[PDB]
Amino acid sequence: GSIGQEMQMGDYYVRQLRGSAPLINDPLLTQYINSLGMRLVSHANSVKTPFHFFLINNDEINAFAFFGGNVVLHSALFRYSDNESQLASVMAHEISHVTQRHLARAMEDTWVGALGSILLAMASPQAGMISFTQQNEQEADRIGIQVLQRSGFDPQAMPTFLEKLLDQARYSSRPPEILLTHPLPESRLADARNRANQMRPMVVQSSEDFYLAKARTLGMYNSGRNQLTSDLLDEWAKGNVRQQRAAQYGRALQAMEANKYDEARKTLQPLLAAEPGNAWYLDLATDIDLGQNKANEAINRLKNARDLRTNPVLQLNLANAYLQGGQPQEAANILNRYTFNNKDDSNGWDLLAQAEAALNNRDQELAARAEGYALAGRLDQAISLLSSASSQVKLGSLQQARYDARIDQLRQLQERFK
């Protein structure tokens, strides 16, 4: 089965990505990027596979995708994206590469590892490299702009973003890495500007989650050219009030990053007072609270949250608060259900490992950190942890049957690829 092979070929590369590339595993940022991405996929034609959207800590702008609906976005995209529709146009562009099976159809002409080595070199700040035909790039722009429009974004954002890539391709000695995987001749641009001119004029406003995502990405995961500049923060202090709340949020982050917690708490207060129930400031409200060993206050606030049952960001934030507060069992009650509902989330497993370690449930601790190692492609290491777990439980027990069964599953993943 091609779709079956593609989905597990994708899982193999995604596991290699987690284990060696610097992915941003932050709950707020990953939930936003996937919520935005899924909103595009839900308006794409002939989607035959699930989709996941990954974020790299890389200041070089690039974007690419491979089998299984897995698209990779560098954090530099938030530095170049002035509006949400520009970032959406890049994801729409990459989503269309997958639906058209461009990378899959290009490979029909040691080889599984040859492609995986290319994928991580493009994602790592340590950079072979894949390239699409300019015909392929035209289909991705043609199909991407229509997904862009049906999703309620500005179609003129795609040519506007392409032109900003061209103005740095000659006003700078460095060709941005995105232009080498996705080449941009003026024909590509003039074709894009023409299509946008022929759709409906639409002025769209970037969501409030976009500016907060842009602030957290550049502020909290700053790296190289990926900074949250004071020039941009002061510029956001003059724009629409969404950018001002985002600008306030960004300085609260940097005040927390520099351990000026009371300075950060007092900056964050007015935004939390206006929106007491949104996850973005709730997330940092606990972060500053635990920075001062006020874990009870973080717990009380999160138990009063409306959407604690539905929002994973809230669920992890409270589990972490229970851990720092000295109640690991309450953290485990949340995380046992959390890890079962999000088996691919390594944040959940790592926190469960912490909770089970604090409870001195060593077999369950080893099994929890085994899942972290399995998600990172460290299957030999995951098997070692579950072997140790299975050696601490009586034979014939279900814990032994379950630990040994999980080892069996990881061995099958292992033999499918060399």
In angstroms, the CA 347 to CA 16 distance is 17
Active site residue 235: no
- Binding of its own copies by 240 (CB under 8 A): no
| 344 is known as an active-site residue | no
Single out the residue of 108, 111, 135, 170 in contact with its own copies (rule: CB under 8 A): 170
20: burial class by Cβ within 10 Å (0-12, 13-18, 19+)?
Answer: middle
The piece of 24-32, 127-135, 149-157, 336-344 that touches Zn ion (CB under 5 A) is: 127-135
Q: Please report whether residue 140 would count as binding Zn ion according to CB under 5 A.
A: yes
Q: Is 409 in the site for its own copies (CB under 8 A)?
A: no
User: Is residue 97 marked as binding?
Assistant: yes
Q: What is the contact mask toward its own copies in residues 178 to 197, using x (rule: CB under 8 A)?
A: --------x-----------
Q: Which residue is nearest to Zn ion (CB)?
A: 182
Contacts with its own copies, 195-234, as mask; x by CB under 8 A: ---------------------------xxx--xx-x----
Q: Which of 1, 108, 135, 171 binds its own copies (CB under 8 A)?
A: 171
Q: What's the number of CA atoms in the CB half-sphere (13 Å) around residue 413?
A: 24
DSSP assignment of 388-411, as one string? HHHTTS-TTSHHHHHHHHHHHHHH
Catalytic residue among 11, 94, 287, 365: 94
Residues 259-288 that bind its own copies (CB under 8 A): 259-260
Q: Is 415 in the site for its own copies (CB under 8 A)?
A: no
- DSSP character string of 290-319: HHTT-HHHHHHHHHT-GGGGT-HHHHHHHH
| CA nearest neighbour of 75 among 249, 183, 250, 213 | 213
Q: SS3 sequence, 180-244?
A: HHCCCCHHHHHHHHHHHHHCCCCCCCCCHHHHHHHHHHHHHCCECCECCCHHHHHHHCCCCHHHH
State which of residues 6, 11, 60, 137 lies at the interface with Zn ion (CB under 5 A).
137
What residues are labeled active site?
A: 94, 141
Tell me which residues touch its own copies (CB under 8 A): 167-168, 170-171, 173, 186, 222-224, 227-228, 230, 254-255, 257-260
